Amino acid sequence: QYLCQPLLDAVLANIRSPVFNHSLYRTFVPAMTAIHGPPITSIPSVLQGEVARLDPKFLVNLDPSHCSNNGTVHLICKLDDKDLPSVPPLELSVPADYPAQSPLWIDRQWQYDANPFLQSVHRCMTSRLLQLPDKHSVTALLNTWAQSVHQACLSAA
Amino acid sequence: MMDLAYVCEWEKWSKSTHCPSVPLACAWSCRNLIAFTMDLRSDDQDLTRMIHILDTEHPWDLHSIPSEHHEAITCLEWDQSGSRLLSADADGQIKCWSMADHLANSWESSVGSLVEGDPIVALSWLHNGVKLALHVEKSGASSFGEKFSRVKFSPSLTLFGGKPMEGWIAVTVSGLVTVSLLKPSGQVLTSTESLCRLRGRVALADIAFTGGGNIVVATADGSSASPVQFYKVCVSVVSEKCRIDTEILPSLFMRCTTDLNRKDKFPAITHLKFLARDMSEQVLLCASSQTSSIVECWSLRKETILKWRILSATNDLDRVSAVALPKLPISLTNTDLKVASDTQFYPGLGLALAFHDGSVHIVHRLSLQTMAVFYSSVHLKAMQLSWTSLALVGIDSHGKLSVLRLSPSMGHPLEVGLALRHLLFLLEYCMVTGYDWWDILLHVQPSMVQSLVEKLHEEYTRQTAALQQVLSTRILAMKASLCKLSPCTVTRVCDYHTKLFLIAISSTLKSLLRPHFLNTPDKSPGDRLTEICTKITDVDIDKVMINLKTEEFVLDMNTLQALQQLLQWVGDFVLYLLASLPNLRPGHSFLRDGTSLGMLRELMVVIRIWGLLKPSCLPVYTATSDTQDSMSLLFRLLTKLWICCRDEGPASEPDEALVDECCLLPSQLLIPSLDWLPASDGLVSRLQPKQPLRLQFGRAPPKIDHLRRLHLGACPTEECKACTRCGCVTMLKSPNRTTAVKQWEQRWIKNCLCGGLWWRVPLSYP
Amino acid sequence: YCIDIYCRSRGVVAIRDGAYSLFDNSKLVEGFYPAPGLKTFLNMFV
Numbered sequence: 025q026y027l028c029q030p031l032l033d034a035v036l037a038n039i040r041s042p043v044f045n046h047s048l049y050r051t052f053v054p055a056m057t058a059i060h061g062p063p064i065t066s067i068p069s070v071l072q073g074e075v076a077r078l079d080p081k082f083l084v085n086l087d088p089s090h091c092s093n094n095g096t097v098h099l100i101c102k103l104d105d106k107d108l109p110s111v112p113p114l115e116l117s118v119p120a121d122y123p124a125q126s127p128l129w130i131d132r133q134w135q136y137d138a139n140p141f142l143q144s145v146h147r148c149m150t151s152r153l154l155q156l157p158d159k160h161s162v163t164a165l166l167n168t169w170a171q172s173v174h175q176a177c178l179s180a181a
Numbered sequence: 182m183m184d185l186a187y188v189c190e191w192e193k194w195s196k197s198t199h200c201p202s203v204p205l206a207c208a209w210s211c212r213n214l215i216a217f218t219m220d221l222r223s224d225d226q227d228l229t230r231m232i233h234i235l236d237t238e239h240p241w242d243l244h245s246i247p248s249e250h251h252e253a254i255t256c257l258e259w260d261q262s263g264s265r266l267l268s269a270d271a272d273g274q275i276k277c278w279s280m281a282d283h284l285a286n287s288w289e290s291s292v293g294s295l296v297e298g299d300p301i302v303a304l305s306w307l308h309n310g311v312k313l314a315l316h317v318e319k320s321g322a323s324s325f326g327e328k329f330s331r332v333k334f335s336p337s338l339t340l341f342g343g344k345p346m347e348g349w350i351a352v353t354v355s356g357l358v359t360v361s362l363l364k365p366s367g368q369v370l371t372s373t374e375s376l377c378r379l380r381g382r383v384a385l386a387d388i389a390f391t392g393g394g395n396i397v398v399a400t401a402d403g404s405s406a407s408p409v410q411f412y413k414v415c416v417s418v419v420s421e422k423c424r425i426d427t428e429i430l431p432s433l434f435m436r437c438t439t440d441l442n443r444k445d446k447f448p449a450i451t452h453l454k455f456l457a458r459d460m461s462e463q464v465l466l467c468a469s470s471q472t473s474s475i476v477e478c479w480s481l482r483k484e485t486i487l488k489w490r491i492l493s494a495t496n497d498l499d500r501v502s503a504v505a506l507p508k509l510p511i512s513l514t515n516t517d518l519k520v521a522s523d524t525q526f527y528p529g530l531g532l533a534l535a536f537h538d539g540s541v542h543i544v545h546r547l548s549l550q551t552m553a554v555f556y557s558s559v560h561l562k563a564m565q566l567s568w569t570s571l572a573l574v575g576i577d578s579h580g581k582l583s584v585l586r587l588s589p590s591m592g593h594p595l596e597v598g599l600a601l602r603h604l605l606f607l608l609e610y611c612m613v614t615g616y617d618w619w620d621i622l623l624h625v626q627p628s629m630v631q632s633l634v635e636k637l638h639e640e641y642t643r644q645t646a647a648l649q650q651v652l653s654t655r656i657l658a659m660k661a662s663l664c665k666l667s668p669c670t671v672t673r674v675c676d677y678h679t680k681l682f683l684i685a686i687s688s689t690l691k692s693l694l695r696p697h698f699l700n701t702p703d704k705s706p707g708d709r710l711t712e713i714c715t716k717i718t719d720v721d722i723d724k725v726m727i728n729l730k731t732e733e734f735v736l737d738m739n740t741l742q743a744l745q746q747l748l749q750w751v752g753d754f755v756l757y758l759l760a761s762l763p764n765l766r767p768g769h770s771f772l773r774d775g776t777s778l779g780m781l782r783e784l785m786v787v788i789r790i791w792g793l794l795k796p797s798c799l800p801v802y803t804a805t806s807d808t809q810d811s812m813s814l815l816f817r818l819l820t821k822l823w824i825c826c827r828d829e830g831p832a833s834e835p836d837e838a839l840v841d842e843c844c845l846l847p848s849q850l851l852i853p854s855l856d857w858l859p860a861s862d863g864l865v866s867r868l869q870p871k872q873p874l875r876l877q878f879g880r881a882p883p884k885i886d887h888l889r890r891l892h893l894g895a896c897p898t899e900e901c902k903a904c905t906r907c908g909c910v911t912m913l914k915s916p917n918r919t920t921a922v923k924q925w926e927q928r929w930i931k932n933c934l935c936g937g938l939w940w941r942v943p944l945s946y947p
Numbered sequence: 948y949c950i951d952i953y954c955r956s957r958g959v960v961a962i963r964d965g966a967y968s969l970f971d972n973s974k975l976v977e978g979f980y981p982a983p984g985l986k987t988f989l990n991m992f993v
């Protein structure tokens with residue numbers, strides 16, 4: 025701005041000439057080189073990060089079935105915990121570009137029938153799924169699953 | 182003998198899977214550019230339809246023309262010059278690629294033929310009637326007319342003058358032949374006609390030419406128990422249109438079918454080749470079974486008047502996978518066979534036969550006895566010898582492209598004078614023609630380099646004063662490229678390139694001055710200036726400038742201003758040279774050359790005159806004083822140096838007054854810096870015998886424009902061409918199309934000054 | 948009195964006179980008077 029303007033006017037006047045840097049060189053390099061001397065002397069890794077940090081309750085493994093080494097990935101988890109009862113395995117479909125979007129829980133209504141207890145597990149799980157914020161992780165789904173199993177143990181007894 | 186100069190492989194782009202191989206083409210031009218196709222087969226089949234152009238001195242930089250050939254490319258074929266490339270595939274479609282903006286990196290085809298659905302099986306440019314023969318027994322004869330002589334050949338289809346038409350002739354897998362004639366205008370005439378009335382399969386074909394302007398095309402249908410038929414084709418132009426006249430010639434059958442012991446083996450003729458195009462009387466055939474093969478040579482020789490008789494045949498081989506015939510046109514008669522056997526000259530007498538094991542056999546032309554053997558340590562699917570036949574290029578049954586050097590005596594040890602005379606003979610052959618001499622520099626050892634340079638200069642003398650005119654810049658380029666190859670002589674190459682540049686400026690400045698009126702006629706103002714500067718030895722610049730009719734030295738003050746950067750180089754080189762005097766450096770040769778210092782004087786005088794007309798054209802010197810006339814100072818020191826060397830038989834060592842005055846020059850002015858042209862990335866200096874370079878494609882194991890002396894930035898924004906031999910860089914399009922000294926810019930459109938081609942360099946984008 | 952010092956490559960240092968110009972030799976720098984005989988003294992060490 026002040027005390028520097030005519031340089032700025034000269035250089036902004038003379039941009040887009042192909043001989044521009046020639047002009048700068050010819051007008052500036054002999055002074056500088058006299059004073060200053062001569063010049064100088066398969067699976068996306070976000071999911072591996074999630075699975076590597078899970079609690080040893082969960083036992084997440086890939087589905088033998090379904091497409092592999094391609095966009096989306098598919099998981100069959102498990103649940104081991106003395107406090108919690110054995111439950112249906114749970115099926116997850118993680119999209120490619122996994123963060124910035126929410127994974128999907130593959131619903132299997134037919135195995136969550138044939139007991140009152142698994143029905144309570146399923147109702148409570150769909151409730152906490154509706155309660156979830158958007159763009160949640162895989163671990164949010166797995167933890168809502170474990171909390172759903174715990175509530176269905178407590179509500180029953 | 183055989184040494185692998187280098188092996189260039191693709192990186193990770195090999196392992197073609199699930200689609201089978203295809204035959205490859207390969208074509209080595211007169212300029213050293215290989216055009217070849219390969220089976221890349223990754224994510225597209227157009228990777229088998231790309232034509233790779235590889236300049237043989239910088240192999241990493243491989244250009245890849247994406248040819249629009251819907252089927253596989255059968256044939257590639259360079260011009261008689263090196264400037265166009267014919268490529269034809271199955272289903273017709275001959276395309277004629279030409280350079281775009283005279284870059285060897287941009288090809289584009291505007292012209293082509295099309296015989297749809299029929300696969301082209303032979304393709305050739307028409308013959309332009311130039312043929313020369315090399316007399317090896319006159320290698321010492323001290324005149325180039327005795328060594329290389331034109332042999333009175335006639336071009337097929339001469340049109341209204343002595344001038345041949347350019348065009349091609351292709352032979353399809355049916356009986357069809359087609360001729361396309363390119364006009365001097367953009368028009369193209371095509372005609373197709375069957376070869377004979379009995380239309381039949383042509384599985385292999387070849388094309389030679391004759392004296393008399395007749396094409397001779399040989400056809401075979403691969404069966405090896407059926408005759409190899411022959412046709413004479415005569416082209417004509419009837420009033421608007423091409424016209425083809427064919428005629429049957431004597432066919433031949435093949436031996437190993439009349440063998441009668443076991444005749445059923447070798448059932449496939451796999452290669453048919455005339456021994457050279459324009460040598461239509463001899464034919465090389467190659468019958469093959471699944472494992473073994475036979476090559477044979479036949480000749481038409483008359484006694485039935487004309488009748489094919491066999492010359493020779495090999496005993497039994499492996500299955501021949503590729504065949505390369507030589508291109509060096511030796512004179513082939515009996516005395517020259519004798520002297521080339523005595524003095525072991527073997528460049529034009531070899532064919533190369535690859536095999537289905539690794540081996541490669543260089544075998545004699547006339548009686549096919551093996552001259553050398555190279556074991557690869559996988560087979561060569563395409564081979565091509567070079568135009569001086571000292572190196573053979575070859576594409577393997579992988580991505581690998583290798584260049585082998587064949588010694589000119591095939592491994593038999595020669596004394597140094599004979600090797601000198603052989604390589605000197607070849608360099609003279611490349612000097613008379615315009616072909617490139619790179620393959621020769623594969624064979625030049627360092628320890629002989631200096632002696633070779635001496636011989637070149639002695640052969641540059643004793644020619645007849647017009648050859649000395651036309652071979653000036655060729656012998657400067659050959660001298661520089663030879664002196665690159667040895668550590669004792671590596672210092673001089675910069676001098677040679679500046680010498681070229683000096684002449685390239687000097688004449689052009691003397692070209693620009695158009696004398697407004699002829700005073701003292703019969704001497705052009707270049708010669709008046711040189712006479713006046715050589716008789717007037719005055720140390721002042723004013724006293725020389727007075728006597729030079731300075732109303733003649735006038736320009737329009739526009740081009741006179743645009744000459745600023747060339748005049749800047751002149752002044753800066755003079756100042757650098759005079760400051761370099763007190764000290765082997767980039768200027769050491771010029772201090773004792775009287776002629777170049779005379780030229781620098783003449784340019785300083787015309788710079789002074791042009792500065793008086795317009796002061797902006799002058800070079801600038803950052804002076805450490807303000808009451809100084811820097812041009813007159815440098816001219817005083819230049820005259821005092823030059824009067825040392827303009828003496829007759831002098832060699833006067835420079836006196837101490839000049840030494841102390843030129844020690845004062847960094848005090849009075851600032852000696853800037855200069856760019857010296859051969860930024861050496863050539864392989865021939867880098868290579869060693871018995872050690873092959875293993876390269877990857879595209880891997881490639883203070884920025885100026887050297888021709889228009891413009892400083893590009895640190896990372897330049899405008900794109901550039903690089904010369905392929907010296908290495909000079911110019912920006913591609915001119916900076917100011919209005920103010921452009923076209924007398925200087927239009928000299929280097931098609932080549933550099935050293936002679937090499939331009940080659941587009943990619944931008945950095947850091 | 949002034950004296951410039953330029954460290955350079957390979958254990959080399961180039962010294963100068965300071966008070967003089969790198970341009971108009973006759974003129975001198977604003978605050979430094981030239982040292983007489985400096986060159987000879989430096990030459991003794993060289």
Ligand SMILES: [Zn+2]
Pocket residue numbers: 904905906907908909933934935936937
């Ligand atoms: Zn060049």
